[PDB]
Amino acid sequence: LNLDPVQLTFYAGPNGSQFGFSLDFHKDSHGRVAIVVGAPRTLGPSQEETGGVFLCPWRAEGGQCPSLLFDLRDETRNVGSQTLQTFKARQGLGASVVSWSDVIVACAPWQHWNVLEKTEEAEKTPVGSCFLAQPESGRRAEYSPCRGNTLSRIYVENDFSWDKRYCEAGFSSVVTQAGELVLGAPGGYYFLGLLAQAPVADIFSSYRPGILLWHVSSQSLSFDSSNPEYFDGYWGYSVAVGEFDGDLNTTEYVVGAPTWSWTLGAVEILDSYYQRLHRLRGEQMASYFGHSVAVTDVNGDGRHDLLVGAPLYMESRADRKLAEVGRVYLFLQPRGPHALGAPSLLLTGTQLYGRFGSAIAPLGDLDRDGYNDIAVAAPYGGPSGRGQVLVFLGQSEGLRSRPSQVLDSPFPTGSAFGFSLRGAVDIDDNGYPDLIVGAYGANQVAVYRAQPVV
Amino acid sequence: GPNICTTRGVSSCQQCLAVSPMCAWCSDEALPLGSPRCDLKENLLKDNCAPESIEFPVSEARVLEDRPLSDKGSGDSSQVTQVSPQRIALRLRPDDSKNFSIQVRQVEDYPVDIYYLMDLSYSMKDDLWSIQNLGTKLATQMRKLTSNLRIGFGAFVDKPVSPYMYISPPEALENPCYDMKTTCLPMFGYKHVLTLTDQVTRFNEEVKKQSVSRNRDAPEGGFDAIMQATVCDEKIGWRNDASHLLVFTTDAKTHIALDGRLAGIVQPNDGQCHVGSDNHYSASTTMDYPSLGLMTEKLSQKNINLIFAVTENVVNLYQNYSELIPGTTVGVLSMDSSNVLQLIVDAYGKIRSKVELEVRDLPEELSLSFNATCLNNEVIPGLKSCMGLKIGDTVSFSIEAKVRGCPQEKEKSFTIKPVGFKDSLIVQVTFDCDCACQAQAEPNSHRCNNGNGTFECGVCRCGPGW
Ligand SMILES: *[C@@H]1O[C@H](CO)[C@@H](O[C@@H]2O[C@H](CO)[C@@H](O[C@@H]3O[C@H](CO[C@H]4O[C@H](CO)[C@@H](O)[C@H](O)[C@@H]4O)[C@@H](O)[C@H](O[C@H]4O[C@H](CO)[C@@H](O)[C@H](O)[C@@H]4O)[C@@H]3O)[C@H](O)[C@H]2NC(C)=O)[C@H](O)[C@H]1NC(C)=O
Ligand SMILES: N=C(N)c1ccc(C(=O)NCCC(=O)N[C@@H](CC(=O)O)C(=O)N[C@@H](Cc2ccccc2)C(=O)O)cc1
Ligand SMILES: *[C@@H]1O[C@H](CO)[C@@H](O[C@@H]2O[C@H](CO)[C@@H](O)[C@H](O)[C@H]2NC(C)=O)[C@H](O)[C@H]1NC(C)=O
Ligand SMILES: *[C@@H]1O[C@H](CO)[C@@H](O)[C@H](O)[C@H]1NC(C)=O
Ligand SMILES: [Ca+2]
Ligand SMILES: [Ca+2]
Ligand SMILES: [Ca+2]
Ligand SMILES: [Ca+2]
Ligand SMILES: [Ca+2]
Ligand SMILES: [Mg+2]
């Protein structure tokens, strides 16, 4: 409602770097808010795409940002009569970024990995990898839970069970308030999808440079399966955390699987032990139900509610014709121990191929009426197809069926305005939560500041 | 007695006709002061109104093009008529309605294009050997139904990029089957092999030189191939006046839109042709898979009938996709594609077993109603689609147009076309709301309040500005 669409702030990065593919707010040890931005196609040392991360200080004028430097050199270690290899070429560093405390977690879902033993090999595959940084101290660490030293022959003999060679860890990410990094890996277990959890502190204290393969005893990966419903389900395309069991000492995980059960799609709520609590099933095949998930309490009963985006949902129209527009589903958590029922609300896009639901950002309380609100992106919506972000306000009964405000893309066509979102943080310290929108197609980030209500 | 035409107490000839389709207007001078000039045409002549001064438009509907339905689609330069009449002239007065008929025929011996799009992933290794004579055998079977057959061939696997593609060792790029004891082709997304031609033995010989490749993940990028085979008109070689059959065969799941992000691909599919002179899809590694809605748009745009010829283990999958892509047919494929021939013949018959009308550019104020006549002269009210038809059958529909009031523009036109058909009925509408006596009005007439008014159709109207 009260986001200022007139006086925006623009940060920008190199041309063709996809600056703004991922973003998040970041507070230093002194509470000073900044913006971390991922640029998965930034050039490395050998003039080859490797990705990069930027840490943008807050300035109402915007402008350029300094790099958050990580190691971009390929590594090699000859140990145990084997040869370990990391390949950072086109790894996509910055394809996902997230901030917790004074720590940044930038991930390269397509960093490749191989192991050589004489004439055999483990196969050069995208295990993924995440880079962790404490900017103030300069501390650095890594986390690649899917690296293995098993050879190709073994997987074949064991029928490709527990095959984490194509995890792409870091595809999606989130950090619990307790400090536990949860990575989505939609390619784990031969494209079934897995989750990988581990405390940030243990990642840092157990990491040394050059080891490549090391143990993180406190980590916890999810489990393989033989159920064909999970095949090619990309379990971990998106991830979020919340409280859905009533026990405040336990943290529950929300996981998106947009191709679960033959492209039907599903979202699953789990405990920290990956034991399934609930499962929301897609409404339409190939709609990519689960592409984006969000957790926030919208009706002000203290119980987190769940939002799921199906950007490719095809709405029904006259004369038996369908129209891809996208759709978002709202699930309100019931009082006490009960199962999440049918959707409480269906928000559907309007612009053809607009992909309404591609991103869903909790905004906090934007208008300060006591109910938290959200923002939904249509990266190719709007009358011009340039992109659109729609705001929906919370209410006692859930959300409003119509948007209170619409942000049209200030960028040219193809900017993917809204592909990434993040809100619920006050960057200018005016008492109102603000919104940052990414447009990787234009290599820019747009900051909308919330002002008092007119 | 008094009726709605008089009791309404109209002011002009235009307002008179707008009351009801039955009203009329008398523009004669010699008319009593008490007698109304807006009444039934029977009452005006009864009151000695000059016949030439009577304005009474009648809603009509006369044909302009009424070619006869062709008995054979063979021969000709596509001078084949399959819809009659092809054009009519409609005239409606306010709030009236007129009906008319249209005939549609599933012409016999109509040309056909069949493009064979085949999965050549390693899972289809034994399927290639069962279609080496398909071209000649398929010619023998379609020869019974059409004298103009053209067939072509294309193949696909998946996006040649990690993780779909094996990238180690270096030998695995040239030979994906390197770790085993066989050679297979380097991986490829989609490659056009044979343009639609009537030389069926070119199909056989091109097939006999094809071999499979090998990729990692079970779902295959066959939807990229469906898009390119649809939007690359000149390269596949679809004919303007012919049935377009796109036979899609596979034994596995398929990749869909937004899957490409597991290879670093985020760019949406633009729906444009990207098959160069090398006959390979060049946007395979840079452009995401297409969506079901975008596929439907280009399939409907190019009049392509998609046929999912998949194995038992994925029929339910593609039967559910077929429902999200109307006009699509599904058939069950044996584990070696031995029955692909009868599968096609049955699909072509099922395709031409329906006639569904479609309306384009219908004005807002116009509403249509349909009554179908399928099978043996059996009327089916409120229906605009027949089913269970056979080649050579003929159906007809009765249509009624109902206009609401009078629009601004007095001439518009819309089209009635069956789904997938070339010919169509064009309806030229003309809204007759005005009176001919308005074209001979007297602005600033001496008869109307010392020139303060206008005299038209035998009455004084207030001029502009008043
Ligand atoms: C292609 O599309 C078809 C049609 O949509 C899919 O088939 C459906 O699959 C779903 C899920 O597997 C089925 O839903 C289940 O229905 C069961 C009862 O169905 C009865 O009624 C139908 C009416 O036609 C009969 O055909 C059927 O034989 C039964 O008599 C319920 O028992 C299920 O509920 C249970 O499981 C769910 C979780 O899924 C729980 O939430 C419930 O509480 C409960 O425990 C469920 O509702 C549906 O019946 C199927 N329809 C048909 C016609 O078969 C295919 O799966 C799909 N295939 C592919 C490859 O995409
Ligand atoms: N629980 C798990 N961790 C797990 C889940 C699913 C799979 C899987 O889908 N495997 C299918 C891989 C596949 O089908 N590859 C294709 C690639 C291609 O089509 O070229 C193939 O060659 N399929 C062949 C050979 C084959 C290869 C691997 C496994 C079985 C069979 C066939 O189905 O005949 C594997 C593991
Ligand atoms: C479609 O069929 C309906 C009903 O069979 C037709 O409506 C009838 O028309 C006659 C003749 O004008 C009337 O006497 C009846 O009262 C109507 N019955 C209804 C409306 O239920 C209708 O005219 C047909 N439409 C077309 C376009 O042929
Ligand atoms: C309208 O229907 C009548 C039957 O009531 C029919 O005689 C007439 O031909 C139809 N109109 C046209 C233009 O065919
Ligand atoms: Ca809990
Ligand atoms: Ca709630
Ligand atoms: Ca609010
Ligand atoms: Ca603010
Ligand atoms: Ca594949
Ligand atoms: Mg295959």
Numbering used by the authors:
A (entry chain A): 1 to 454
B (entry chain B): 1 to 466
From the reporting publication:
Integrins are heterodimeric adhesion receptors that transmit outside-in as well as inside-out signals across the cell membrane. Ligands of αI-less integrins such as αIIbβ3 bind to a groove located in the interface between the α- and β-subunits. When activated, the ectodomain of αIIbβ3 undergoes large-scale structural reshaping to an extended conformation with an open headpiece and binds with high affinity to the two distal ends of a fibrinogen dimer, causing platelets to form tight aggregates. Within fibrinogen, αIIbβ3 binds not to RGD, but to a 400HHLGGAKQAGDV411 sequence at the C terminus of the γ subunit.
Some αIIbβ3 antagonists have two carboxyl groups, such as Ro-435054 (22). To test whether the second carboxyl group would orient similarly to the α-carboxyl group of KQAGDV and AGDV, we soaked Ro-435054 into crystals. However, crystals were preserved when we soaked them with 1 mm Ro-435054 for 2 h in Mg2+/Ca2+. The compound bound to both αIIbβ3 molecules in the asymmetric unit and induced shape-shifting to states 6 and 3. Density for Ro-435054 was well defined; however, electron densities for ADMIDAS Ca2+ ions in both molecules were very weak, and ADMIDAS Ca2+ ions were therefore omitted during refinement. Ro-435054 is a 4-residue peptidomimetic, with an N-terminal amidinobenzoyl, a β-alanine, an l-Asp, and a C-terminal l-Phe. One of the nitrogens in its N-terminal benzamidine overlaps with the ϵ-amino group of the Lys side chain of KQAGDV. Most importantly, the side chain carboxyl of the Asp residue and the α-carboxyl groups of the Phe residue of Ro-435054 align very well with those of the Asp and Val residues of γC dodecapeptide and AGDV. Most interestingly, the C-terminal Phe residue of Ro-435054 adopts an identical orientation to the Val of KQAGDV and AGDV and thus may be considered a fibrinogen-mimetic. The dicarboxylate αIIbβ3 antagonist Ro-435054 binds the high-affinity state of αIIbβ3 ∼100-fold better (KD = 6 nm) than the low-affinity state (KD = 580 nm).
